[PDB]
Design a protein around this ligand. Structure first.
Ligand SMILES: OC[C@H]1O[C@H](O[C@H]2[C@H](O)[C@@H](O)[C@@H](O)O[C@@H]2CO)[C@H](O)[C@@H](O)[C@@H]1O
Length: 400
């Protein structure tokens, strides 16, 4: 089901796959081992689906936030770098791929959203979200708009929602409290309420997705977008005079992007775990490998110490780091997917006017907390009963 003697790799359509294939070709040339790169859709859902029955890729690339849930499902192999190699990467990056004492992936890069603006339309960019509406009024009269960014994917809206108090799970004394969810606080209400208002005041469209925001920005139709470093190269092709900067503050407080570490995990069912380790350690995570991917779509602020000191001088990276320190490193816990489904439903509903901000978040709060708990209970019931019918038929029930 996974061919012994070859490497298949999954990484998302927005990332430097053609650049990674290049690294795959170099590997193939020293070791004779063919490396194949693919980007199926809904990768982060497609992976556990197929790997759960022993198929899928030898290697899986996603942000570190999904990996806790994969490791917990027994889907990843433990990764075991020698001290000397661990040393070449930033402590905090290893930390985000650490789950229950075990490293469960290789950290590749630090990804954070920034405000991307067109210097020709908007020479000085807004420092605040509260100035965006007025700005749009003025651009509208020129057949232009202030801002478009993907509203379909809560990853994008979230730094506004967190700005005044939203959070996934509370973090104190080294552990997460999956019973303390921060999606329906007053601050998360204010944040979404502002976003929803921009829609009501027709300063944005509820349908705006990733394609639509990217085409509009890169064609000069809109003065601002919110996007991660992978988007920079398409904008370079456009020749649009752009800057990458700090996100606008809301109610006076910085916007809080969820920070992701692009990680690479080995499929626990892979019969090429040794080849997979050599490709990631001696080929990808080098000045050579990273630069090959980064040339295709920029990775952000790479894990590897030696190559980050070059990338660090770039103002678009610094903008990334400043956005990143103002935000929070995503949790990697299994209950995270529950937080994301619930918030995806909420933003979508309040934006499309299907529910108010308040009924939207009230339901997101209930649902994230219950799905979170459900994820934990389910694990334990598997520990108590493995797969006696008592096990399957208790799970069946508990989920509804
Ligand atoms: O919005 C839900 C989604 O947010 C994050 O996914 C990001 C990803 O980390 C980035 O690498 C880039 O591809 O944008 C994605 C969303 O469009 C979370 O990592 C992901 O788990 C979550 O479902």
């Amino acid at each position: 089901k996974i061919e012994e003697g070859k490497l298949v790799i999954w990484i998302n359509g927005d990332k430097g796959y053609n650049g990674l294939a290049e690294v795959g070709k170099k590997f193939e040339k020293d070791t004779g081992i063919k490396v194949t790169v693919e980007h199926p859709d809904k990768l982060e859902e497609k992976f556990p689906q197929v790997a759960a029955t022993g198929d899928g890729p030898d290697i899986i690339f996603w942000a570190h936030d999904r990996f806790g849930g994969y490791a917990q499902s027994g889907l990843l192999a433990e990764i075991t770098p020698a001290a000397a190699f661990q040393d070449k990467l930033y402590p905090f990056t290893w930390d985000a791929v650490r789950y229950n004492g075990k490293l469960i992936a290789y950290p590749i890069a630090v990804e954070a959203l920034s405000l991307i603006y067109n210097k020709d339309l908007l020479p000085n960019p807004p420092k605040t979200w509260e100035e965006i509406p007025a700005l749009d009024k003025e651009l509208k009269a020129k057949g232009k708009s202030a801002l478009m960014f993907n509203l379909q994917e809560p990853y994008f809206t979230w730094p506004l929602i967190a700005a005044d108090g939203g959070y996934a799970f509370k973090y104190e004394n080294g552990k997460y409290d999956i019973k303390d969810v921060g999606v329906d606080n007053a601050g998360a209400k204010a944040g979404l309420t502002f976003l929803v208002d921009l829609i009501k005041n027709k300063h944005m469209n509820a349908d705006t997705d990733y394609s639509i925001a990217e085409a509009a920005f890169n064609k000069g139709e809109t003065a601002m977008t919110i996007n991660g470093p992978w988007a920079w190269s398409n904008i370079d092709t456009s020749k649009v005079n752009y800057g990458v900067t700090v996100l606008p503050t809301f109610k006076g407080q910085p916007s809080k992007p969820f920070v992701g570490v692009l990680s690479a995990g080995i499929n626990a069912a892979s019969p090429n775990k040794e080849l997979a380790k050599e490709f990631l350690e001696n080929y990808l995570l080098t000045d050579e490998g990273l630069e090959a991917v980064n040339k295709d779509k920029p990775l952000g602020a790479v894990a590897l110490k030696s190559y980050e000191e070059e990338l660090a001088k770039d103002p678009r990276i610094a903008a990334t780091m400043e956005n990143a320190q103002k935000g929070e490193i995503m949790p990697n816990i299994p209950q995270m997917s529950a937080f994301w489904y619930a918030v995806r439903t909420a933003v979508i509903n309040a934006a499309s006017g299907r529910q108010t901000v308040d009924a939207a978040l009230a339901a997101a709060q209930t649902n994230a907390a219950a799905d979170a708990l459900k994820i934990t209970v389910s694990e334990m019931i598997r520990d108590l009963f493995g797969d006696s019918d008592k096990s399957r038929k208790l799970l069946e029930s508990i989920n509804m």
